[PDB]
Design a protein around this ligand. Sequence first.
Ligand SMILES: Nc1ncnc2c1ncn2[C@@H]1O[C@H](COP(=O)(O)OP(=O)(O)O)[C@@H](O)[C@H]1O
Ligand SMILES: Nc1ncnc2c1ncn2[C@@H]1O[C@H](COP(=O)(O)OP(=O)(O)O)[C@@H](O)[C@H]1O
Ligand SMILES: Nc1ncnc2c1ncn2[C@@H]1O[C@H](COP(=O)(O)OP(=O)(O)O)[C@@H](O)[C@H]1O
Ligand SMILES: Nc1ncnc2c1ncn2[C@@H]1O[C@H](COP(=O)(O)OP(=O)(O)O)[C@@H](O)[C@H]1O
Ligand SMILES: Nc1ncnc2c1ncn2[C@@H]1O[C@H](COP(=O)(O)OP(=O)(O)O)[C@@H](O)[C@H]1O
Ligand SMILES: Nc1ncnc2c1ncn2[C@@H]1O[C@H](COP(=O)(O)OP(=O)(O)O)[C@@H](O)[C@H]1O
Ligand SMILES: Nc1ncnc2c1ncn2[C@@H]1O[C@H](COP(=O)(O)OP(=O)(O)O)[C@@H](O)[C@H]1O
Ligand SMILES: Nc1ncnc2c1ncn2[C@@H]1O[C@H](COP(=O)(O)OP(=O)(O)O)[C@@H](O)[C@H]1O
Lengths: 215, 215, 215, 215, 215, 215, 215, 215
Amino acid sequence: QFAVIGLGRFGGSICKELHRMGHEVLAVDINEEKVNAYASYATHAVIANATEENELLSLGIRNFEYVIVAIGPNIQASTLTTLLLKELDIPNIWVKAQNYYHHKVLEKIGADRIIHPEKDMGVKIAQSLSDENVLNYIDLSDEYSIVELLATRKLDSKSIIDLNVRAKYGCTILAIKHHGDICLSPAPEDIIREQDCLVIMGHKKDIKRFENEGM
Amino acid sequence: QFAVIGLGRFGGSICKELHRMGHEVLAVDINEEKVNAYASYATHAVIANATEENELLSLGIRNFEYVIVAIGPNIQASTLTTLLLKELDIPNIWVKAQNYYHHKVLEKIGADRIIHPEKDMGVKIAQSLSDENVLNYIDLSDEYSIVELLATRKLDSKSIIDLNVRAKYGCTILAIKHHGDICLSPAPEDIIREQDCLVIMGHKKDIKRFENEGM
Amino acid sequence: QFAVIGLGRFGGSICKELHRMGHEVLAVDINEEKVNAYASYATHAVIANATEENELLSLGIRNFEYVIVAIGPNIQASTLTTLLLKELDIPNIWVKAQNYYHHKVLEKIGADRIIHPEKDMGVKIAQSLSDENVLNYIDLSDEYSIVELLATRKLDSKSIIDLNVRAKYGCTILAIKHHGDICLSPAPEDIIREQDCLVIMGHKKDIKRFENEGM
Amino acid sequence: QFAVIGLGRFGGSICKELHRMGHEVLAVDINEEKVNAYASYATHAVIANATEENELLSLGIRNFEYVIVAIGPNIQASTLTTLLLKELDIPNIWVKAQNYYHHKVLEKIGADRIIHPEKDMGVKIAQSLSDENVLNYIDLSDEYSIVELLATRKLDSKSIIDLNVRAKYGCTILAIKHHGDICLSPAPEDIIREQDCLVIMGHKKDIKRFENEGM
Amino acid sequence: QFAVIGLGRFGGSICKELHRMGHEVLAVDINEEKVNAYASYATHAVIANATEENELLSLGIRNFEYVIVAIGPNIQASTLTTLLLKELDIPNIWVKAQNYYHHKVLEKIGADRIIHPEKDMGVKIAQSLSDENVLNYIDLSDEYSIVELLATRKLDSKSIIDLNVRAKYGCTILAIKHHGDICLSPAPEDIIREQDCLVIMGHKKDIKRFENEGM
Amino acid sequence: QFAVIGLGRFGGSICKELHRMGHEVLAVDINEEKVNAYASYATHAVIANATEENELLSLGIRNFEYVIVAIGPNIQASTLTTLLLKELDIPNIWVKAQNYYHHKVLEKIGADRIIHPEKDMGVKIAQSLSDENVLNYIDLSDEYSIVELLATRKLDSKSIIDLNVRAKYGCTILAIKHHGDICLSPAPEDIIREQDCLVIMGHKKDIKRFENEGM
Amino acid sequence: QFAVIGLGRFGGSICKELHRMGHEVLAVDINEEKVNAYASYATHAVIANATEENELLSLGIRNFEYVIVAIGPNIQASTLTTLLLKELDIPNIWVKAQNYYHHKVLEKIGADRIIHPEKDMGVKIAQSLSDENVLNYIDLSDEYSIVELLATRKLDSKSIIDLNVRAKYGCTILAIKHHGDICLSPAPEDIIREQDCLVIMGHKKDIKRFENEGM
Amino acid sequence: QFAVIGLGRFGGSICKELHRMGHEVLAVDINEEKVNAYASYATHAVIANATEENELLSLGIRNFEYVIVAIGPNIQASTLTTLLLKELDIPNIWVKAQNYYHHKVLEKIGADRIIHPEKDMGVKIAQSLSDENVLNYIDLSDEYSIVELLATRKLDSKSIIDLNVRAKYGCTILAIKHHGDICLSPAPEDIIREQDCLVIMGHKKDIKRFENEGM
Ligand SMILES: Nc1ncnc2c1ncn2[C@@H]1O[C@H](COP(=O)(O)OP(=O)(O)O)[C@@H](O)[C@H]1O
Ligand SMILES: Nc1ncnc2c1ncn2[C@@H]1O[C@H](COP(=O)(O)OP(=O)(O)O)[C@@H](O)[C@H]1O
Ligand SMILES: Nc1ncnc2c1ncn2[C@@H]1O[C@H](COP(=O)(O)OP(=O)(O)O)[C@@H](O)[C@H]1O
Ligand SMILES: Nc1ncnc2c1ncn2[C@@H]1O[C@H](COP(=O)(O)OP(=O)(O)O)[C@@H](O)[C@H]1O
Ligand SMILES: Nc1ncnc2c1ncn2[C@@H]1O[C@H](COP(=O)(O)OP(=O)(O)O)[C@@H](O)[C@H]1O
Ligand SMILES: Nc1ncnc2c1ncn2[C@@H]1O[C@H](COP(=O)(O)OP(=O)(O)O)[C@@H](O)[C@H]1O
Ligand SMILES: Nc1ncnc2c1ncn2[C@@H]1O[C@H](COP(=O)(O)OP(=O)(O)O)[C@@H](O)[C@H]1O
Ligand SMILES: Nc1ncnc2c1ncn2[C@@H]1O[C@H](COP(=O)(O)OP(=O)(O)O)[C@@H](O)[C@H]1O
């Protein structure tokens, strides 16, 4: 169902995680050591030169609905492999881009999805660092978002009804994680202790306001 | 306030994004072309070898609360710089890891946060790939998460009270995005049309169950 | 001014002819024997892998306004070379296509002109053999053309005013070549002897008619 | 009437085009897929080894006036087949040459015409390259020729009587192609717009002069 | 009397051996180093392209009764030269064949003898591996042959009258070579010691029988 | 029992002939086309790189008593393969040599037999040329040999007792092949007709004498 | 007393030699074949992952005064192990360095001695190549050294009092090795024959002078 | 004058040092990063596969008197390179060996010197560790050596005439290094302070005795 062509920092992780989720994955790599190392982290693992189409045919690459092209240092191999896969009518081809150029040519040669892993992780890191409180988040839209927060001393021993976010800031608390224990959709009587995870939901500026005055 | 030591695919993105957000960032790089290219995407841009202590002193690296070590292909510059920075009492040192090892030695030499961009983006892509429906998500913990979904035909013209997720699956719907318009914490009378964004919250396996039988 | 990347049956001819015309041409080839053989048929001759970018940089390939990619047996090397050249902002990139696919991908990766030598030669030869008389020709458009013909016995000792092509077929005679001697824009009194070259100009179907009934 | 022995890039084109012109063609090929692919582009299509005499006899190869030997990568099949055909008293044997040698031995073993498709296409393209404007041409002799030109801005909105080529350069304009529309033997009042096709006729050097000072 | 056109692994050996036997040989080669190296192993040695007729005339190739064409890597030079030699009415033309094809076209263009050295050496080596004992042999017919054998322990100190091959196996012993000393048509009293050469003559199967039970 | 590692002009013939004799042979070749072509001419045929040890182990090369290493274009692969086989304690390793050097290094790395096909065939052809008559022969020693001759008119209708070779020249007639029919150890009354095969045995110079005066 | 953690080209030799000298050594390796191979060349041999702390504790690694970290293929095992050992208060940790980096991080994480085997052996061999005569040497300081020299013809049959190095060049001869026989601190009457070992001692530039004018 | 084929831990150091000494060195490497990194540490630096003969010819490798083969991970490439160099009549070929086997085969294919760097460093460390005083040493022969020592407290304020090594142990003191200052061939009145460098010369076992009872 899934094929990973490059078993490196990026593709190897995709393979390992897909395998961990319970899906069947065929891992490909030109380097024998990589193939051997991911033998336990994949349904099948094969040594093959991705630059030769007949080898791809030998892999039975057409039997897959999703083929992942994760070759980083070599743009040549990346775009060429993507091309060969595009020849074989692969339904979905996802390729890692190195730069603007790579993104462009992959875009033109019919890549289904082009990923800039470092960049996207970068915006995650940037938002996570800009305000020390947010551990993680998800953007529902340009204006609205759900935010995971690290409780400070200002929130210690404070109740949900005490911190009336639903009216004063128009945001809503979703979950509280305390010492690994978790509380989903907590009742107003619940207490928030410091260093705990607080899951708020609402408008970005409003969340920023609550962060400002509340914590 | 923030310093980016490696201006590559990863660090360059962090610098550019931080600059876009309005924060002041000092970009460092041993390659002159990189420094020149990021002159417009940073408050200041300097050519310097991060492995040389006197150069670090010349940068005024101690004046920063956050220093990001993002050097990928060469572990040398990364761990050595991290070490030198740990000597200079940098409050927060965030470093990009290449493998299990890099993570280990960074962990022991006092790295405040170790990032595996390819790995985490890898698992994100993996989750996004396992189900085409999930557009984005956030993990509250090892077991609990909030998931953004792309509504299918099975969910078309269905009401929230019709899809009783709060009891049948123990999950809760948070938001519905329809043609760009957005509905936060929607009432049970609200209708979900296909191709819309559906924000569910709960246990991973339970959300998967709802995905299986519901949509 | 001109660069030939593949010194084979096709590209080698381009190089040799361009050199014969008096233009300065840099010939490239991965095969040393080929490079040696075309040393006398080029301003400069270099051994280089067209698939390696730095080698292209070493060639000073950017200093050329026209670079010809003539690699036949390997589609990989062809599209790859075209790609690398497209990176280096080469003004005009002309590439040999092997098949429909090759034409497509070259088209998408920004090839300025795509040549099917076999095909065009095929149609030229097809028109040349279909009619025993046609020695050569040029197509002005999809419908109109100028045709060179070999005079038969039916045309022997016939005058231009006798063979009134300007009215009977709407075509015009341009030149008559007799025993090597040549007559341009001949007067109606001129005589056409057999085995001579006759240059007619007009519509294809009309020329075919004149061929059918006249000669 | 016509037989094509090699259905490749070259011979396949000859077969397809000949079939398109309305002539009856028998296509031969050692490869079954090729034979199948040209079933629709030929009167008949047969699987046969051109190096085997009895197979040639089985084809009824003697019933043809023109047999085309187009086998490229393998000189063996080409010269051997040509030889067998010369034995069977084939009226016209046309063979594709790979190099100087192939031309030589085909010449000696009684080939009626030896074709270097890449070479001639090469010189055609070469003349097309020396001047960007010339789209096509025909040489009447060593000194005289008819040339098709691409009108530049210098020729825009210019009349034929304005560009007095018949006296100033001794050349004559034959046709003007404007937006696909075509004008044969145009009157001096006619206007030439840029990017149009201009058909001049005369001496090579004179045409070059007109190209130089005029456009 | 003898001319060697290709001074390689094959032709060079022929030249050297013919020269060693006392015959006068003219060695030809396009490579100067070869010509220099075979100067001492030939009556005369000349640098010449065997594909050029005027050079062949300059060699005085017609003055030779035997001309050997030994060019391996290039089928071109071989068949073309053979052709030119056939034009010049050379009495005997012997050419080395590369494959079935080379044999075919040489056969048709009037080669006096076509040699497949590797192949015939192949059957000799095949017999040499098939039987541990035979040092050399000659086939009189499809069924009858003369065989040279290496004496084993089973033949040590055995007399000819002891090994009655003329009646028991119907074969006849011809010669015995002992420590370089040689005995032709030996008398029945003669002794055969091990590691000596034994020359038997008769039917193949019978010789095999004698090998089986005797030695 | 027998393994052929290089399926070319030399090794392929060894394989084919060994197979023809009825022995079981495993053919190896890195080129798939070669392996396919010799599938019918071998017990088993495998695609394998002879320079790779694990592949050799996969072949079960140790199960063979005779392994033939025949490499023409690449001396490296030859000596390396011979080396690996010598490591695996192969009883008999026979290798084709390209030159003196190759012979030396093969000699030192423990090659069991080194064959120069061109050389030996060269001297055989040389003796075949020295005398137009000799069809075949075998050398018993440096001075003594058995020779096969093509009878001329001088020997026509001559009896063995008429041509007293046993006394006048000290050589002995062994066999006469007459119209394909064969006579072994013929009686003195037997007649020799021209164009028949005559098998003489004796001293080289004496045989030459008999050729001189007799035929 | 001594523990060798990596049994490769470097560490294996250390273990074998230390064992040969009579010291007790515990050899460690993650590879079972290596551990088995060095069972006879060590007091004890154990299979263990040097990156796993509990395994190190199981080894009783604290009971050793000297632990050698020689792991080649990856910096990971080396620095991580060195780190763990520095944690466990190992008295002496000597580690093989891969590059400048490895040296740096080992230096900072408290490595007692960092070895560049290739670097030092490389510069020694380099000295052996720059001057063919010097077989070996040792540097007492930046300026002074003892050098072993290979006697040339210029030194043949020369006496020590003849070559007054102690006064003319300020260097002193220490030993003369002749045909394996050795003379320590030789008297001025002793003779030096060519191809013998000559042990000089003094200033580098002075030794170079003596080499220049003397030999 | 010197060529380095492998720019790794070993060969790279040789190149750098040879360049540092003032000699001209041509550095070769199949990896571009290595070639670029050693551009400043060599007269010339080239990307080339050492296993390809024509590339070696292109390098002008024959123009060198010394060619160093330093390729570690691939024994194949090593021996093949050594082989090709042996073909080109290179005067001196020095190769790094990986193991006993490699040493053997390099020995047989005509390697001029075979180096095991790690082994020698291993034995050096082995001698250096039993007694901390030995910093370094040199073996004059199997039995005799010169040793550099670190003076202990037992040697503090002791005179040369006090420590009569020339008679009691048969060894001779050569030099004393005190605070960086150096004394060559010191007089018996000279004093040795602890932790100073003491250069002894004599028999290995005797030196060991002196170390045991004396220091
Ligand atoms: N030509 C090729 N064919 C097949 N696989 C390749 C080729 N080139 C590189 N790879 C594989 O791609 C991987 C690249 O990994 P890496 O450089 O870490 O990229 P990323 O950072 O995207 O993971 C390597 O593990 C390598 O085995
Ligand atoms: N010692 C050093 N000092 C300063 N900058 C360095 C040093 N080593 C590497 N760099 C810089 O770090 C950058 C690494 O970027 P890149 O390889 O793209 O990392 P990633 O792939 O993680 O984005 C390079 O542009 C380089 O200039
Ligand atoms: N990667 C490459 N880099 C440079 N030159 C190449 C490469 N691959 C092939 N070539 C050259 O291209 C030529 C191919 O010529 P050929 O196959 O005859 O094409 P055509 O039939 O169009 O002339 C060869 O001579 C070869 O040397
Ligand atoms: N012996 C043969 N008999 C018949 N057809 C052949 C023989 N050998 C080759 N062919 C055909 O000739 C074609 C060669 O085409 P190709 O190599 O593309 O030539 P070119 O490059 O000149 O177009 C192949 O499709 C093959 O099927
Ligand atoms: N056109 C030619 N004219 C003369 N000599 C030639 C020509 N072409 C090749 N040769 C010679 O033939 C030799 C080929 O030898 P080789 O390849 O070893 O053949 P073989 O393996 O049959 O001995 C080369 O040394 C070359 O000098
Ligand atoms: N490294 C290798 N491993 C295995 N087979 C090889 C290798 N290199 C070449 N070969 C095979 O050897 C054959 C070469 O045969 P050829 O050059 O005809 O030798 P000969 O002239 O002795 O017949 C090729 O068909 C090729 O498949
Ligand atoms: N994590 C580990 N724990 C223990 N031993 C290891 C580990 N990783 C590698 N080794 C051993 O270290 C040895 C390294 O040898 P080698 O690669 O030759 O290094 P070098 O070239 O520095 O001598 C290998 O034999 C391997 O068995
Ligand atoms: N086939 C090859 N041709 C040329 N250079 C090579 C080849 N294979 C490896 N190399 C080079 O040899 C070097 C190997 O060095 P390394 O593995 O560090 O050995 P060592 O540690 O003994 O120096 C690498 O830098 C690599 O670029």
